Nucleic acid binder design. Structure first.
Ligand code: MG
Ligand code: MG
Length: 95
RNA sequence: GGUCGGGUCGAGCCUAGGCUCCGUGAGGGGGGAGAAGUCGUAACAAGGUAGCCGUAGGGGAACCUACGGCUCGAUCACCUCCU
């Protein structure tokens, strides 16, 4: 079929609003509470993330409010591919 | 031994008068770390206006300009002074 970063384990879907700075990313998920993603060191080299890139992250059971952590990105050949299956509704990106 | 009178040493207790210690503090100010946030290019080569020191004025910010000094300034010419 296809190998896509679905929610495996406890993953989250990160669609960011603004970069306050130094790696903090305010994310706007379907969950509601303002989460603030940060980044590991394996990908800070070869990839390039910005706004509008729906990507996958991972949250942390501490306070479940401001969490998230990048593990892998999405390429433009998947971001809109993930619409027809309805796995994610894009109206969590226009309001 | 008790009671009244007079002096003498007296800790505490109360008043107001100055000092400092002590945690909680509205609001303000700089310091140090994070370097996939934004604006520029000040320094190092003659860093593209040579850099730096004292004093005063100015500017989003590194910074700019006027007077007096230093070489820890590079290139061409002509002198000058010696080995
Ligand atoms: Mg310059
Ligand atoms: Mg200069």
């Amino acid at each position: 079929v296809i190998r896509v970063p679905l929610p495996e384990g406890n993953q989250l879907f990160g669609v960011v609003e603004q970069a306050l700075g130094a790696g903090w990313m305010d994310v706007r998920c379907e969950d509601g509470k303002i989460r603030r993603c940060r980044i590991p060191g394996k990908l800070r080299r070869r990839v390039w993330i910005r706004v509008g890139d729906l990507v996958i992250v991972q949250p942390w059971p501490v306070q479940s409010d401001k969490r998230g952590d990048i593990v892998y990105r999405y390429t433009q050949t998947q971001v809109d591919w993930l619409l027809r299956k309805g796995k994610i509704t894009q109206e969590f990106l226009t309001g």
